[PDB]
Design a protein around this nucleic acid. Sequence first.
RNA 1: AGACAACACUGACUAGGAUAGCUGGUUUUCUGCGAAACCUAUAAUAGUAGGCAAUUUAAGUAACAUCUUAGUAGGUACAGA
RNA 2: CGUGAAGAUUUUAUCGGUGAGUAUGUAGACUCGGAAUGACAAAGAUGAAUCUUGAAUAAUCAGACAUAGAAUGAUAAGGUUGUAUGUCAAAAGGGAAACAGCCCAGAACAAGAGUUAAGGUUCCAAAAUUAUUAUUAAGUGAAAUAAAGAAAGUUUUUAUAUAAGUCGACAAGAAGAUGGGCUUGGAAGCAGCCAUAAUUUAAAGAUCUCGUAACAGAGCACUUGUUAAAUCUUAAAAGCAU
RNA 3: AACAAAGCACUUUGCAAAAAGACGAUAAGUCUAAGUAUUGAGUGUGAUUUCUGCCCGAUGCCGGCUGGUUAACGAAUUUUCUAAAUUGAAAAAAAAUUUGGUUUCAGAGGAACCCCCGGUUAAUGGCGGCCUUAGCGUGAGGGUCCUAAGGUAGCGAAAUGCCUUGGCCGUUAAAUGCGGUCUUGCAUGAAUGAUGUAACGAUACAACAGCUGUCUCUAUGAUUGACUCAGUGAAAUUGGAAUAACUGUGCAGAUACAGUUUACCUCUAGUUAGACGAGAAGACCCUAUGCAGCUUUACUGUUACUAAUUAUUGAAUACGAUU
RNA 4: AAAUUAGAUGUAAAAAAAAAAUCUUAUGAGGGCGGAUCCGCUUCUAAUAUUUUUUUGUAGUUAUUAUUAUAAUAAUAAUCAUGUUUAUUACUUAAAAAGCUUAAUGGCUUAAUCUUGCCUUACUGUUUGAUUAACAACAAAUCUUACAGUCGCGUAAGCGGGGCAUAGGAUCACAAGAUACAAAAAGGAAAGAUCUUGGAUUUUUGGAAAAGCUACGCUAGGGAUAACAGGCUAAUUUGCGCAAGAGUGUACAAAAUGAGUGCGCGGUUUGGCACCUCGAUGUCGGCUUGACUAAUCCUCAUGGAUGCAGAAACUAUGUAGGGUACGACUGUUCGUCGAUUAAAAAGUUACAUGAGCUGGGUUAAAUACGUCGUGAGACAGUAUGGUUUCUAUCUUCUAGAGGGAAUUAGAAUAUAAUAAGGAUUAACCUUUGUACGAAAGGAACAUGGGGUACUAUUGU
RNA 5: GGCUGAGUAGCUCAAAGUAGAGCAUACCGUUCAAAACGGUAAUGAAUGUGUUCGAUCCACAGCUCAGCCACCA
RNA 6: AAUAUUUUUGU
Lengths: 168, 46
Amino acid sequence: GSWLEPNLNRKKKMMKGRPRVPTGGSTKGTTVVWGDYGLRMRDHHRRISAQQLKLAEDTIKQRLRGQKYRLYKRVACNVGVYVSGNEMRMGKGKGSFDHWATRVAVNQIIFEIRGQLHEQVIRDAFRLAGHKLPGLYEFVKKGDPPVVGITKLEDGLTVEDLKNPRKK
Amino acid sequence: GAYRLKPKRTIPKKLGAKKTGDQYVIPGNIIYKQRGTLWHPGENTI
RNA sequence: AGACAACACUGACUAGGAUAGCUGGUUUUCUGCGAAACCUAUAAUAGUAGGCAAUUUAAGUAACAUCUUAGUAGGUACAGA
RNA sequence: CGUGAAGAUUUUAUCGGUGAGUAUGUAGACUCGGAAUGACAAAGAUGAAUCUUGAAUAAUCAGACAUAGAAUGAUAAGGUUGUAUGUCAAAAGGGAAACAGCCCAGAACAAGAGUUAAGGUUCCAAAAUUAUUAUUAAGUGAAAUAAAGAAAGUUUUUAUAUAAGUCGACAAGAAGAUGGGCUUGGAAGCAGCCAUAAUUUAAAGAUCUCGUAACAGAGCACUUGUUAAAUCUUAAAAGCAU
RNA sequence: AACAAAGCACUUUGCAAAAAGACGAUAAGUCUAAGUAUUGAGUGUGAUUUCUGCCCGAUGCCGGCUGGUUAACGAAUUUUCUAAAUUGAAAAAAAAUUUGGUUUCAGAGGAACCCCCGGUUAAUGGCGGCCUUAGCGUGAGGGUCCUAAGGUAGCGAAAUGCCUUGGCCGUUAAAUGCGGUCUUGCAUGAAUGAUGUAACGAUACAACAGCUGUCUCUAUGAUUGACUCAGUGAAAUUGGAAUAACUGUGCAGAUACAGUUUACCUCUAGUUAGACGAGAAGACCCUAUGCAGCUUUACUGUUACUAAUUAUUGAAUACGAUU
RNA sequence: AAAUUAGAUGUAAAAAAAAAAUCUUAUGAGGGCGGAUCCGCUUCUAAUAUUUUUUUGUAGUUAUUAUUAUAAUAAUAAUCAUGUUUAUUACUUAAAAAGCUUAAUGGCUUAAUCUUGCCUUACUGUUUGAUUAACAACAAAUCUUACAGUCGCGUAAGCGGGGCAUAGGAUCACAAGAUACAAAAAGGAAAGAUCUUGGAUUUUUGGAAAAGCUACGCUAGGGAUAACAGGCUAAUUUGCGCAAGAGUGUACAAAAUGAGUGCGCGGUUUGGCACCUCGAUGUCGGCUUGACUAAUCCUCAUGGAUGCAGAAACUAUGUAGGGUACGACUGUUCGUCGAUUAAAAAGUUACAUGAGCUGGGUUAAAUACGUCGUGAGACAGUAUGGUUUCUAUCUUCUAGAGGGAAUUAGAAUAUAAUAAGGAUUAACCUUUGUACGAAAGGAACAUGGGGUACUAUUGU
RNA sequence: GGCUGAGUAGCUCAAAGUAGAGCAUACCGUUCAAAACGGUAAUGAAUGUGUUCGAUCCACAGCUCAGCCACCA
RNA sequence: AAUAUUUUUGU
Ligand SMILES: [K+]
Ligand SMILES: [K+]
Ligand SMILES: [K+]
Ligand SMILES: [K+]
Ligand SMILES: [K+]
Ligand SMILES: [K+]
Ligand SMILES: [K+]
Ligand SMILES: [K+]
Ligand SMILES: [K+]
Ligand SMILES: [K+]
Ligand SMILES: [K+]
Ligand SMILES: [K+]
Ligand SMILES: [K+]
Ligand SMILES: [K+]
Ligand SMILES: [K+]
Ligand SMILES: [K+]
Ligand SMILES: [Mg+2]
Ligand SMILES: [Mg+2]
Ligand SMILES: [Mg+2]
Ligand SMILES: [Mg+2]
Ligand SMILES: [Mg+2]
Ligand SMILES: [Mg+2]
Ligand SMILES: [Mg+2]
Ligand SMILES: [Mg+2]
Ligand SMILES: [Mg+2]
Ligand SMILES: [Mg+2]
Ligand SMILES: [Mg+2]
Ligand SMILES: [Mg+2]
Ligand SMILES: [Mg+2]
Ligand SMILES: [Mg+2]
Ligand SMILES: [Mg+2]
Ligand SMILES: [Mg+2]
Ligand SMILES: [Mg+2]
Ligand SMILES: [Mg+2]
Ligand SMILES: [Mg+2]
Ligand SMILES: [Mg+2]
Ligand SMILES: [Mg+2]
Ligand SMILES: [Mg+2]
Ligand SMILES: [Mg+2]
Ligand SMILES: [Mg+2]
Ligand SMILES: [Mg+2]
Ligand SMILES: [Mg+2]
Ligand SMILES: [Mg+2]
Ligand SMILES: [Mg+2]
Ligand SMILES: [Mg+2]
Ligand SMILES: [Mg+2]
Ligand SMILES: [Mg+2]
Ligand SMILES: [Mg+2]
Ligand SMILES: [Mg+2]
Ligand SMILES: [Mg+2]
Ligand SMILES: [Mg+2]
Ligand SMILES: [Mg+2]
Ligand SMILES: [Mg+2]
Ligand SMILES: [Mg+2]
Ligand SMILES: [Mg+2]
Ligand SMILES: [Mg+2]
Ligand SMILES: [Mg+2]
Ligand SMILES: [Mg+2]
């Protein structure tokens, strides 16, 4: 399969589900691991579709065409969305397959790029991909600390300092 | 159900612990109902 | 033309003999207690029965509720791959 | 390479598969790890009889909303269906302008500048025009947060520039090998392709925006000088505003 | 436009005691009819011109074997209990056979309907697909599958055509209309009749001429009401009302609640925006193990009618079969 | 590619001894002390476990090497072996899977699997305690215990009342066996009763032998429940905006243009929900009469426009004062079309307005066509026809009055500040054939177009 | 919008242990030549994926599809 | 004497 079309069966339906909301101090997926830069969702957790992620890649390729780069995708559309007709009435079972989607938590990286290009040339690519993706996104470099919830672990801040009941 | 109705409501089996630790029991009292041997019979149990 | 058969006709009028799990109504005061809209069954779903369970006032209580201390069952949030 | 068609033998940063990884992510039908809560029973203590049984004997079996967390819908519904807690139903009174379900609090009857909860104290209207420190100039807002986003609005903080003249303006310069090579009717920095170690200078990209049919020409990067600031440069982040 | 209708067609009725048909808790009997196959009854169609095609498979009716089936009837069978006798047992004993009484099983043969054969469409009814081509094209022609038979003549965007305001022509300055025509007809069709004229129509649609207050666009005039005075004197209606506007609220559309605003008290004639105005316990929709009528190859029944037979009811030859 | 067979982990098998400590146990010493074996405190001893603990010993046998005088000593190597080497035995070999009567889940490998021997407890009667008092009742159920009876297997202990577990409906009636209960005068019997057992899509499976139409319809009820409108919601729309900028624009992103998207407003469509109304909220168009919104068709002011010469037009910002007509077709809203016009734009108000009108459509009874149905009949299929009620009590409203309260003793006449409404269009000529333009074409500003009277102005 | 039934040789049609029989086609022979005729041969189970010892066959999802229902206001 | 299969085409 692929990151937009998995090797799953469309017959077996899936529940709506909910994105991951780490409430225990988890930095899972909030850092650049492969490339030099990244694109972080910094507003709220959502469920991005395979059509909104396909256009994001096409928007980055169009802006960086003719240049040497390596685009990494850190999200997979492994959630089958099933929609019943918006003209039908309530009941009569669950809806039919509509599209593949992926649930993303807050402050999680979406794309990562590694190439012999200028930083400002990559910003414009990630800036255009954010105006066409659902929500708000941010430009992230490699080496910067992870994010626990909506708070970055900057200036020596650790996950245990956030769990300490005393903060004042 | 769905487009084709299919009632699916089975009688509850109520499997699990019927007696907790340090609970008084006389001969015959069920202590644990289970499918298979999750717990095995020990001392003075059948 | 389901037309007409004397206010009525997809079957008149009159006397005699009904039911209605439905709607409506049920009249003085003080005092004590005080629900439910759930489960199971039902040619059953706006009905009913048995339970849970409201009330009366007798006999019981090692009753019931709650906390403390020690112990047990079970895998949710979370976290992880 | 090679045979009459055959195929044979080597390579790839091509597609699929296989092995390894204490690599990264993903979770209703994964849980190696693992709460709180809730549940069961034992003893003790406390408490408002609230419990059980005997006898006698009902109503109810259209529920609603709030909060949390889900399924479903469209991550819509004052939607539908479970779970946990409460209220309403059957609960008046105070607050939420008005209010079944929300925040407080459970009305037997009177008296009191009585004592308090939620909530509030300039006037309507009982009580502060009460003290302290900042922000806003928009009546923003003041008891139902409209979004992304823009911007010499303003404040703070963290960096950073400055009599070695920051910032701004003004004056002059901004070369040469050389119309780079290619392409093109023509391509001279400036249609397009390839290259873009040098040289000489106070500095000057085989060229960032205009201009030419193509040259020419006007600007920029960059360089010098003059004017001139003794808390006064530039940028970012955050707070409240437009 | 429905019904009837003259006409048309099919089925039925031989009259000897009752023609068939209708009626008669049910008969005698009556109409039919003091009629007789050119009579009566029933069914469909709906004068006339031109016409009425194919299928008897299904369903219905009718006819037909020295046939099969065949209830009653019935040749041949088979039991339960009990009494007596015999037999047996004769040990604490049944058991078996026969007869009486009692109570069961049992079916060679043996009617109609039915099975079987045939007939009937102006009886109820039914009257099809697929590929291929003289070049593209068109499809005369040629392939095949199935049916009882595959819609014939005619008609055809129709009172029938959803798509659709179908294409074209005429009519209109402008045609979703009307008329004509082409028709590949969702879903025309031949007595559930097909089709074209004359005549007829308070039927329906469309056009022309004339005509007009229908309209451009209303005006004036007359009478009776309306209005006032005198006389007489109702009705529906009404929880009680000191019965304003806005925004919000709320069983979710406020005269009545919140806030603000506005308004001196009271009548008359007009007007109908609201009072979810009045009237009729919504005909629509849904509910009730509520009704009524109708329908049928719904369930369970009764009849018309058909078939066999005891009885009333006796003979005779046969012919023949059981044996 | 796919047939059979043989394989697919490693370790151990001469043998220990001793000292202390930390617990935990003991039906050990009948321990001691408070209240023999009861209980909380308790020392001692024993046993298991735990320390990485303090160590000691690690030989013998066979053989090798070195030294010493074949033996001794030291080191090194091998060493389960008195046993048919096909050795054997103990332990170990992830998870999944296979197997265990059938789906799925859990479980079993130390048996619930497999092999073999003997068997048939897949027994009879009664009975215990449970399923936190089976299924949130009852009933049909499930697991388990004991006594008696008599069978199997096993050396024995003991095991066995079907299957690894969780999915097979009663009574009645009927049929076959047993019990010896009762026997409607009596002796029998029949028909009953108890025990065991069989035959069920009693599948609406706590268990009726059961097809439709009604538009001719009726009654009792329901906003507990649909159609109209309102409310909530905003997927969607025939309603819009903002952000970004692939691309078009001979050049040049933003004059115009704007793919696929993102962030929103709005409440005008189709829906969703079913909150109000079924002891009654009349409904599509038309007429009449309005009121309001502004997302603008015309008219007025105006920015941008290699793509603004002029003119016209495009786009955008202000702005809703007025206007947005006539006719043919269709029941039509809508839409198509004809011909004028400065233009012939929209929407909300119960898709405003039927106690203001109309009734062509939709939606009753009648009838026909086609289609469907065996039929009665039905049809977002089509046709012709088809009773449209009400004297206004109240609020609001349009007009007119009776009374009154005014700086105030009361009048007549004429009246102000001020308030509430009303009026509200557009085009052409002159200017001027001027600006602009190669030409065609053709503005803006300003003046006048009240007068065959006055006056003003232009000609004669 | 919502269900149902179908798909095999070039063209027809038949059929969980099979793929058959026609027509067409091809080779040859008959005729002066061609057709007809005669003789002798070669042609398939859609699209995957499951079930089963084995699938034209059973199950499932697509493509092609045709047919039917889209009723009361 | 009373018999009777079929057999198209040729710029
Ligand atoms: K009822
Ligand atoms: K009380
Ligand atoms: K009380
Ligand atoms: K665990
Ligand atoms: K404000
Ligand atoms: K007729
Ligand atoms: K006729
Ligand atoms: K026939
Ligand atoms: K027949
Ligand atoms: K007439
Ligand atoms: K109400
Ligand atoms: K009114
Ligand atoms: K065995
Ligand atoms: K007797
Ligand atoms: K008429
Ligand atoms: K005045
Ligand atoms: Mg975005
Ligand atoms: Mg079932
Ligand atoms: Mg009728
Ligand atoms: Mg009548
Ligand atoms: Mg309750
Ligand atoms: Mg029943
Ligand atoms: Mg609700
Ligand atoms: Mg509800
Ligand atoms: Mg109630
Ligand atoms: Mg209250
Ligand atoms: Mg307040
Ligand atoms: Mg006080
Ligand atoms: Mg005060
Ligand atoms: Mg060059
Ligand atoms: Mg005739
Ligand atoms: Mg007769
Ligand atoms: Mg005929
Ligand atoms: Mg026949
Ligand atoms: Mg007989
Ligand atoms: Mg017989
Ligand atoms: Mg016979
Ligand atoms: Mg024809
Ligand atoms: Mg006919
Ligand atoms: Mg009078
Ligand atoms: Mg209101
Ligand atoms: Mg009041
Ligand atoms: Mg009036
Ligand atoms: Mg009222
Ligand atoms: Mg077994
Ligand atoms: Mg229970
Ligand atoms: Mg039942
Ligand atoms: Mg049950
Ligand atoms: Mg009718
Ligand atoms: Mg409701
Ligand atoms: Mg301009
Ligand atoms: Mg004005
Ligand atoms: Mg209206
Ligand atoms: Mg009205
Ligand atoms: Mg009045
Ligand atoms: Mg004007
Ligand atoms: Mg003059
Ligand atoms: Mg010739």
